Amino acid sequence: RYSRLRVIAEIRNIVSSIEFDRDDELFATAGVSRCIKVFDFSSVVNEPQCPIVEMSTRSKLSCLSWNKHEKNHIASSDYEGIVTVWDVTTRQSLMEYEEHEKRAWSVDFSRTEPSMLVSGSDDCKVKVWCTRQEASVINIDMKANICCVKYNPGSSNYIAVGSADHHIHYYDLRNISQPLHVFSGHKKAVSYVKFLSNNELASASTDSTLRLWDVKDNLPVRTFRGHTNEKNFVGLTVNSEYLACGSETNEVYVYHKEITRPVTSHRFSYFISAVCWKSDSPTMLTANSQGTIKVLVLAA
Amino acid sequence: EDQMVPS
Questions:
Q1: Which of A16, A31, A189 sits opposite B6 (nearest CB)?
Q2: What superkingdom heads the lineage (chain A)?
C-alpha cells in the first residue's frame, strides 16, 4: 500500500517533543531551546511559518502532552524535574508540580480521566497528578531511572513505565505495591512506550529495536529492526497499524505492526528527535536535532 | 549532552 514518505511541509536546537492537540488541529513543539511553540496544522500545510503561541520556560523540555478534554491545556516535563500544565490561550502555567528531584523525561495526560497526568524521572520515581490537586496523588519508588510513562488509552488504571533497567513495568495504579507484569526483552534502556490499542503496547530502546507486547495476556509479540538508535531519544509514535521512530542516521523509519523490517524510510551529525502520527491517518509530524520540522505522509 | 537516554 505504501512505499515512501512524501514531504508536504517543512519548517526550517533539538526538538524533544512534537504533539497534536485533541482535535489534530494545532500541534506543539518543545525542546532544548526552552520554548513551547504552537502551530496551526492547516496553515503549515497550506503556506510557504510562524507559531500562533510561544511560551518561554525556565528549563529545557523533554516532553509534551496535550489534554484530551480541555482543548487549550498542555503539559510539559523539564530538565529540572518540573511538570507544568499550561493554557495556550492565556500563556499561563496553571499548575507547577515540583516534587521530582531530577530531570523528568516524560509526561502523559490520561485520555479517559483527563484531569490525571503521569510523569517519570531520573529520580527513579513515577508520579501521578490530578490537575485539581497540588500534591501528587500516587508515587511509585522504582530502582532505576524512568525514561517514559504512558497511560493505557482505555483506562486510567494502567500505565506502562519504560526504565533504564531495560524492562517495561506495567502497573495497575489501584495497587502499586507490585506491577501487574514486567516485560523483559530489550537489551538496553527502554526510551519510549506507546499503545496501539487497549491491549497492544509498543516500546523503543537504545538496543536499536522497537518491540510489540500484549498487555492482556502478558506476552512478547514482535521485534522491529532496521534503524540505528544506540544513544539518543529519537522518537516513537504509533497508531492502530503503524509504528514510526527516529534514527541516529537522521532518517525516519515506518514499520507496519505485522512486519519486522521497515515499510519505508525517509532521509531528513544529526538525529531524528521527535515524531507524532496524525491519529490513524498516514500523515505524521517529525523533527530532528537541528530543529527542523517536517510534515510527512505515507504514500504509494 | 541533551536528549541522551540514561545508561
A1: A189
A2: Eukaryota
Q: Walk across the sheet containing A125-130 and list its strands.
A: A104-109, A116-121, A125-130, A138-141
What method was applied to determine this entry? X-ray
Residues of B in contact with A32 (CB under 8 A): 2-3
Chain B nearest-CA distance from A32, in A, is 8
Instruction: Say yes or no for a CB contact (<8 Å) between A32 and B2.
Output: yes
Residue A43 lies in domain: 1-300
Find the helix or strand (DSSP H, E) in which A256 lies: strand A251-256
**Distance from the Cα of residue A26 to its chain's centroid:** 16
Chain B residues 1-7 with CB within 8 Å of chain A: 2-7
Dihedral of CA atoms A173, A176, A178, A183 in degrees, nearest 10, equals 40
Distances in Å between the alpha carbon of A149 and those of A16, A64, A124? 15, 12, 12
What span, in angstroms and rounded, lies between the C-alpha atoms of A183 and A187? 12
Strand arrangement of the beta sheet that strand A168-172 belongs to: A146-151, A158-163, A168-172, A181-183
* Dihedral over alpha carbons A14, A17, A18, A21 (to 10 degrees): -150
A17 touches chain B (CB under 8 A): no
CB burial string A235-244: b at 16+ within 10 A, e below: bbbbbeebbb
Establish if A189 touches chain B: CB-CB under 8 angstroms.
yes
**Resolution at which this structure was determined, Å:** 1.4
> Which chain B residues are closer than 8 Å to A273 by Cβ?
3
- What CATH number should be reported for the domain holding residue A36? 2.130.10.10
